[PDB]
Amino acid sequence: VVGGTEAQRNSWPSQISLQYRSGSSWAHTCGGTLIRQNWVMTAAHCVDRELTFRVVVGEHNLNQNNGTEQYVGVQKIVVHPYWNTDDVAAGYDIALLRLAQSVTLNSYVQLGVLPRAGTILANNSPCYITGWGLTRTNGQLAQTLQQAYLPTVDYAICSSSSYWGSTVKNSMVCAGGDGVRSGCQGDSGGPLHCLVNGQYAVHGVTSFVSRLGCNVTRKPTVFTRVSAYISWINNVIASN
């Protein structure tokens, strides 16, 4: 997250860190949303590599013991059957990860609240991005969970030529584009939390930024639209 502020420990308890096994170490690669005690929602592209993955819940500082973490292996990965590595701009950037164990819920570990199917927000809807991603374009990861106020940019505007044009589909959410705050590498697969009827719900799964840079004016961060996928999500979980 470029232009973030440090999150409070208990603000976003559905955020996980998706990590891969790197020599003898575990490195952060993506964010995710805990949507059941045994199911994580992330981006497809974050599990295109055949790595050994683990999920960390209750995580605040990547490099310290917070006293709150639970570290859980991934037992099954279900990517959207339409996902194509070679075409992010097509969409379907979403995956469900089944956890080897159920986690325990507490004030650091909760489930993310999903939108009703078909829900579109109005332009300029108040949402936050959260993540341990790069804090500058070509920068480094954050140690602590960053948050950024990232208001939505409607389809009509986002698809217009000055903005993303044709690259963005109506199965996506655009948020931000001010030149100052954005998603950046390592935020991918995480949440976009938006305030609807007094409740934060997870509307977006972070998917891409511009090739020219993370924080680029009139290139909002682009998210998979979760509300486009509710029947898919539900069908996966009922049947595994």
Q: Which residues are annotated as a binding site for Ca(2+)?
A: 59, 61, 64, 69
The number of residues that bind Ca ion (CB under 5 A) is 2
Beta bridge partners, 40, equal 34, 97
Q: Known catalytic residue: 93?
A: yes
Residue 40 CB, nearest distance to Ca ion (Å)? 18
Binding range to Ca ion, per CB under 5 A, among 29-37, 55-63, 106-114, 119-127:
55-63
Residue 17 CB, nearest distance to Ca ion (Å)? 9
Which residue, 59 or 93, is less far from Ca ion as judged by CB? 59
For Ca ion, the binding residues in 133-152 under the rule CB under 5 A are none
Q: Starting at the edge strand that comes first in sequence, how are the strands of the sheet with 5-6 ordered?
A: 5-6, 146-149, 127-131, 191-196, 199-208, 221-225, 172-175, 152-153
> Integer distance in angstroms from the first to the last C-alpha of the chain?
33
Question: For residues 17 and 40, what is the distance between their CA atoms, to the nearest angstrom?
Answer: 10
Q: Does 66 bind Ca ion (CB under 5 A)?
A: yes
Name the active-site residue from 14, 17, 28, 45. 45
DSSP string of 176-218, one letter each residue: --SSS-B--TT-TT-EEEEEETTEEEEEEEEEE-BTTBSS-TT
DSSP 106: S
Which residue, 66 or 70, is less far from Ca ion as judged by CB? 66
Q: Known catalytic residue: 87?
A: no
CB-based closest residue to Ca ion: 66
Question: Which residue in the set 61, 119, 137, 143 belongs to the binding site for Ca ion (CB under 5 A)?
Answer: 61
Q: Known catalytic residue: 188?
A: yes
Question: For residues 179 and 223, what is the distance between their CA atoms, to the nearest angstrom?
Answer: 17
- Phi, then psi, of 79 in degrees rounded to 5: -95, 155
Which residue, 108 or 128, is less far from Ca ion as judged by CB? 108
Which residue, 70 or 217, is less far from Ca ion as judged by CB? 70
Q: Which residues are catalytic?
A: 45, 93, 188
Which stretches of the chain bind Ca ion, using CB under 5 A?
61, 66
